[PDB]
Design an enzyme around this catalytic site. Structure first.
Site, PDB file in Angstrom:
ATOM      1  N   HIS A  12       0.760  -1.238   0.000  1.00 18.81           N
ATOM      2  CA  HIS A  12       0.000   0.000   0.000  1.00 18.81           C
ATOM      3  C   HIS A  12       0.792   1.290   0.000  1.00 18.81           C
ATOM      4  CE1 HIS A  12      -3.629  -2.317   0.532  1.00 18.81           C
ATOM      5  NE2 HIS A  12      -3.145  -2.861   1.631  1.00 18.81           N
ATOM      6  N   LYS A  41      -5.368  -9.813  -7.318  1.00 18.46           N
ATOM      7  CA  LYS A  41      -6.063  -9.213  -6.181  1.00 18.46           C
ATOM      8  C   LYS A  41      -7.092  -8.250  -6.775  1.00 18.46           C
ATOM      9  CE  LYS A  41      -5.312  -6.769  -1.807  1.00 18.46           C
ATOM     10  NZ  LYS A  41      -4.268  -6.256  -0.868  1.00 18.46           N
ATOM     11  N   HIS A 119      -3.369  -3.030   7.587  1.00 19.78           N
ATOM     12  CA  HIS A 119      -4.471  -3.306   6.665  1.00 19.78           C
ATOM     13  C   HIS A 119      -5.019  -1.991   6.162  1.00 19.78           C
ATOM     14  CE1 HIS A 119      -8.565  -4.456   5.393  1.00 19.78           C
ATOM     15  NE2 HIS A 119      -9.039  -3.640   6.314  1.00 19.78           N
ATOM     16  N   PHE A 120      -5.315  -1.929   4.879  1.00 18.00           N
ATOM     17  CA  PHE A 120      -5.966  -0.778   4.282  1.00 18.00           C
ATOM     18  C   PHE A 120      -7.467  -1.080   4.222  1.00 18.00           C
ATOM     19  CE2 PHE A 120      -7.535   2.248   1.332  1.00 18.00           C
ATOM     20  CZ  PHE A 120      -6.733   3.347   1.532  1.00 18.00           C
ATOM     21  N   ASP A 121      -8.271  -0.321   4.963  1.00 19.96           N
ATOM     22  CA  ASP A 121      -9.701  -0.613   5.049  1.00 19.96           C
ATOM     23  C   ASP A 121     -10.559   0.085   4.015  1.00 19.96           C
ATOM     24  OD1 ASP A 121     -11.378  -2.399   6.677  1.00 19.96           O
ATOM     25  OD2 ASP A 121     -12.428  -0.627   7.378  1.00 19.96           O
TER      26      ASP A 121
HETATM   27  N1  LIG Z   1      -9.747  -4.456  11.408  1.00 20.28           N
HETATM   28  C1  LIG Z   1      -9.157  -5.223  10.466  1.00 20.28           C
HETATM   29  N2  LIG Z   1      -9.762  -5.566   9.326  1.00 20.28           N
HETATM   30  C2  LIG Z   1      -9.163  -6.346   8.411  1.00 20.28           C
HETATM   31  N3  LIG Z   1      -7.937  -6.869   8.524  1.00 20.28           N
HETATM   32  C3  LIG Z   1      -7.286  -6.572   9.639  1.00 20.28           C
HETATM   33  C4  LIG Z   1      -7.835  -5.738  10.698  1.00 20.28           C
HETATM   34  N4  LIG Z   1      -6.997  -5.564  11.711  1.00 20.28           N
HETATM   35  C5  LIG Z   1      -5.926  -6.304  11.331  1.00 20.28           C
HETATM   36  N5  LIG Z   1      -6.088  -6.888  10.115  1.00 20.28           N
HETATM   37  C6  LIG Z   1      -5.032  -7.721   9.503  1.00 20.28           C
HETATM   38  O1  LIG Z   1      -4.423  -7.010   8.442  1.00 20.28           O
HETATM   39  C7  LIG Z   1      -3.858  -7.943   7.524  1.00 20.28           C
HETATM   40  C8  LIG Z   1      -4.256  -7.486   6.130  1.00 20.28           C
HETATM   41  O2  LIG Z   1      -3.447  -8.221   5.211  1.00 20.28           O
HETATM   42  P1  LIG Z   1      -3.812  -8.304   3.660  1.00 20.28           P
HETATM   43  O3  LIG Z   1      -5.139  -8.975   3.441  1.00 20.28           O
HETATM   44  O4  LIG Z   1      -2.614  -8.950   3.000  1.00 20.28           O
HETATM   45  O5  LIG Z   1      -3.831  -6.775   3.143  1.00 20.28           O
HETATM   46  P2  LIG Z   1      -4.991  -5.680   2.983  1.00 20.28           P
HETATM   47  O6  LIG Z   1      -6.126  -6.114   3.879  1.00 20.28           O
HETATM   48  O7  LIG Z   1      -4.332  -4.411   3.475  1.00 20.28           O
HETATM   49  O8  LIG Z   1      -5.319  -5.645   1.530  1.00 20.28           O
HETATM   50  C9  LIG Z   1      -4.354  -9.312   7.992  1.00 20.28           C
HETATM   51  O9  LIG Z   1      -3.326  -9.925   8.757  1.00 20.28           O
HETATM   52  C10 LIG Z   1      -5.543  -9.005   8.879  1.00 20.28           C
HETATM   53  O10 LIG Z   1      -5.878 -10.000   9.837  1.00 20.28           O
END
Ligand SMILES: Nc1ncnc2c1ncn2[C@@H]1O[C@H](COP(=O)(O)OP(=O)(O)O)[C@@H](O)[C@H]1O
Length: 124
Positions: A12, A41, A119-121
């Site tokens: 990201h 992705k 994590h990017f939400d």
């Molecule tokens: N609130 C959250 N929502 C979603 N994923 C989260 C949250 N908090 C932590 N995470 C963690 O962030 C990571 C996200 O990794 P990934 O799926 O590769 O990337 P992204 O979600 O940024 O596209 C995971 O290990 C996930 O469990």
């Protein structure tokens, strides 16, 4: 042995371009950052701000996460970002994406000590 924090930077962060993302930016970046190895992705955002500025979001506005957790934070300031969204005709391994630059508030989830983005939400 890549940490979650390191993975967030790879997936990201793109502080090296002040945003000037060509129509082929996502096609190039999604592959260069290894987001199309096992498949394409579907969606992924890159942030064009300094690392310090993105890490600082973990101390900013606490907002509910899409998954219902309480560890998400929205940036007070808007940030330069690029959204990548797989095209309707994209066929792995030939992953194809639409590139859209924007200036929006980001929402990231943070974990750990130090407390950093993992994590990017969403962007809003
Ligand atoms: N609130 C959250 N929502 C979603 N994923 C989260 C949250 N908090 C932590 N995470 C963690 O962030 C990571 C996200 O990794 P990934 O799926 O590769 O990337 P992204 O979600 O940024 O596209 C995971 O290990 C996930 O469990």
């Amino acid at each position: 042995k890549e940490t979650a924090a390191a993975k967030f930077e790879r997936q990201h962060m793109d502080s090296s371009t002040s945003a000037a993302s060509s129509s082929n930016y996502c096609n190039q970046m999604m592959k260069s950052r290894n987001l199309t190895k096992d498949r394409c992705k579907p969606v992924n955002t890159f942030v064009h701000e300094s690392l310090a500025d993105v890490q600082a979001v973990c101390s900013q506005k606490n907002v509910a996460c899409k998954n219902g957790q309480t560890n998400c934070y929205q940036s007070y300031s808007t940030m330069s970002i690029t959204d990548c969204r797989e095209t309707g005709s994209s066929k792995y391994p030939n992953c194809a994406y639409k590139t859209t630059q924007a200036n929006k508030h980001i929402i990231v989830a943070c974990e750990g000590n130090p407390y950093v983005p993992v994590h990017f939400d969403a962007s809003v």
